[PDB]
Design a protein around this ligand. Structure first.
Ligand SMILES: Nc1ncnc2c1ncn2[C@@H]1O[C@H](COP(=O)(O)OP(=O)(O)OP(O)(O)=S)[C@@H](O)[C@H]1O
Ligand SMILES: [Mg+2]
Ligand SMILES: [Mg+2]
Length: 347
């Protein structure tokens, strides 16, 4: 029952896995803090509310085709070098919320330093709390890092705030759970992961969500560690979450950022967070996308098809510093849906 001090005193601060403020980039907002246990259970399913509103991320692809809900839990699935951390930075930059909580689990110390430098550059400095653990820490503290980030998010949610929590990565948190379980007598069950791991991923992953007070919307990064190897964890985490964003290294090599493969992504809350007009426009654009990709890798029909493909790829491509209001995103959605209605038809 390890506890830690959380609250307004950690705003604009960097916390080590035990809640010690090791750095600030903002004068302390206020000296208000509770003691809280960092590993508690999710709230009762019957105390939840529905994922109603959308969360406007300012990213066109997400807000248009994969709209997130306030209280949703979303995964960011990618192999190496596809831009998970950069997508996190863009989401922090362009999303509107009261508090942003980031949990860096088991990265190099220099990566922690680079993230904190980016955090210092931003205009939302006073709204952010970073909790970190490097690979040099024991696995216990790597688990405590994510648990503590979740606890900070929960504090500010109980204050009635819209919180956005990030965990980079859930792959490393799962491996740290595995190592702590193994190094205490527990036996492996599936791909060397002890059984308790599978009971302890949702325990953490089901803590975010909306309540009668405020809300926590959560993004978790998952590594697609190699083909045809061990990925029981990627699939299990996919199971636990309310959707996922897949980043293809195909698009990443082109420089098409964010490297979101829309056809491989889904927001399982899209139906209840979007208007019916938006929903049918999004279905039209998804039909158009899949119809175009059916051709891609194979006269004037093909001219129109591929120039439309270029237009769509350009509309999806968007730099980190660039922000798109929901209105602008929706009008672009309407235009491409129009392009599905009046279509060239090469078959
Ligand atoms: N959206 C983006 N915009 C611009 N460059 C990007 C973007 N995403 C990735 N990059 C490039 O990729 C580099 C690092 O990408 P990352 O965001 O770290 O991907 P990653 O999957 O998080 O890597 P890991 O954590 O080591 S597996 C950046 O320094 C850029 O050169
Ligand atoms: Mg990363
Ligand atoms: Mg695995």
């Amino acid at each position: 029952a390890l506890s830690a001090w959380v609250g307004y005193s950690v705003l604009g601060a960097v916390l080590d896995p035990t809640g010690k403020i090791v750095e600030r980039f903002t004068p302390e907002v206020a000296p208000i803090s509770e003691e809280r246990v960092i590993d508690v259970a999710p709230p009762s399913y019957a105390s939840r509310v529905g994922v109603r509103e959308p969360l406007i991320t300012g990213v066109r692809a997400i807000d248009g085709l994969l709209t997130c809900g306030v209280g949703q839990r979303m995964g960011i699935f990618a192999s190496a070098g596809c831009g998970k951390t950069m997508l996190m930075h863009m989401l922090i930059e362009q999303t509107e919320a009261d508090v942003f909580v980031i949990g860096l689990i088991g990265e190099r110390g220099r990566e922690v330093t680079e993230f904190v430098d980016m955090l210092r550059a931003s205009h939302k400095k006073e709204k952010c709390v970073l909790v970190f653990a490097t690979s040099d820490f024991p696995s216990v503290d790597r688990c405590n890092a994510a648990q503590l980030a979740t606890t900070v998010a929960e504090y500010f949610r109980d204050q009635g705030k819209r919180v956005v929590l990030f965990i980079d990565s859930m792959t490393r948190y799962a491996r740290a759970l595995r190592d702590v379980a193994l190094a205490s007598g527990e036996r492996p069950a599936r791909r060397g992961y002890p059984a308790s791991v599978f009971d302890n991923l949702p325990r953490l992953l089901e803590r975010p969500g909306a309540t009668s007070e405020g809300s926590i919307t959560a993004f978790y990064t998952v590594l697609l560690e190699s083909e045809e190897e061990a990925d029981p964890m990627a699939d299990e985490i996919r199971s636990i979450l309310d959707g996922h964003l897949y980043l293809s290294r195909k698009l990443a090599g082109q420089g098409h950022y964010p490297a979101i493969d829309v056809l491989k992504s889904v927001s399982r809350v899209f139906g209840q967070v979007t208007t019916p007009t938006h929903a049918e426009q999004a279905s039209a654009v998804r039909k158009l996308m899949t119809r175009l990709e059916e051709l891609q890798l194979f006269n004037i029909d093909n001219d129109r098809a591929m120039q439309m493909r270029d237009s769509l790829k350009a509309w999806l491509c968007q730099p980190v510093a660039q922000y798109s209001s929901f209105d602008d995103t929706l009008s672009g959605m309407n235009a491409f849906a129009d392009q599905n209605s009046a279509w060239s038809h090469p078959q």
